[PDB]
Amino acid sequence: TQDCSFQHSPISSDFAVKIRELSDYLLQDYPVTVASNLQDDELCGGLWRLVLAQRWMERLKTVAGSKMQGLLERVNTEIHFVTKCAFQPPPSCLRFVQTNISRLLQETSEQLVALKPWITRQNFSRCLELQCQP
């Protein structure tokens, strides 16, 4: 079974800085998406969204200018650890809804904060399969 756990915490302490820096050069209502029906799971929840947010940082880098690429990539690095785990592609039941990139960035920050005290204490093996709610 693919496992997923972090012995040492992957979250850096100045991640909120790299996000405020990206936001300083962003057109805040740029359309991105967020899952609208992610199952309520107090252990995998933030992790699922970080994986999704992470998938967005990559897509954004491809249509970003030389200098915006660095700000994206630098925020990408703060949450790229989620790929250390074999997360499965989103299920067909997962619905996405258009939201401002400022919303996505704000939530990502929040998820890192809430995840910080637990990232190294929990076994996240069952988070690999993203789950839906109706």
Contacts with Zn ion, residue ranges (CB under 5 A):
3, 12, 14, 40, 83
110 binds, among a copy of itself, Zn ion, none (CB under 5 to 8 A by kind): none
SS3 76: helix
Q: Taking phi first (over 0 means left), then psi (-120 to 50 degrees means alpha), and beta for anything else, what does residue 28 get?
A: alpha
29 binds, among Zn ion, a copy of itself, none (CB under 5 to 8 A by kind): a copy of itself
Residue 32 neighbours by CB under 8 Å, 6+ apart: 56, 60, 98, 99, 100, 101, 103, 104
Which is nearer to Zn ion, 70 or 100 (by Cβ)? Answer: 70
Taking the complex as a whole, how short is the minimal distance between the CB of residue 134 and Zn ion, in angstroms? 13
Taking the complex as a whole, how short is the minimal distance between the CB of residue 101 and a copy of itself, in angstroms? 8
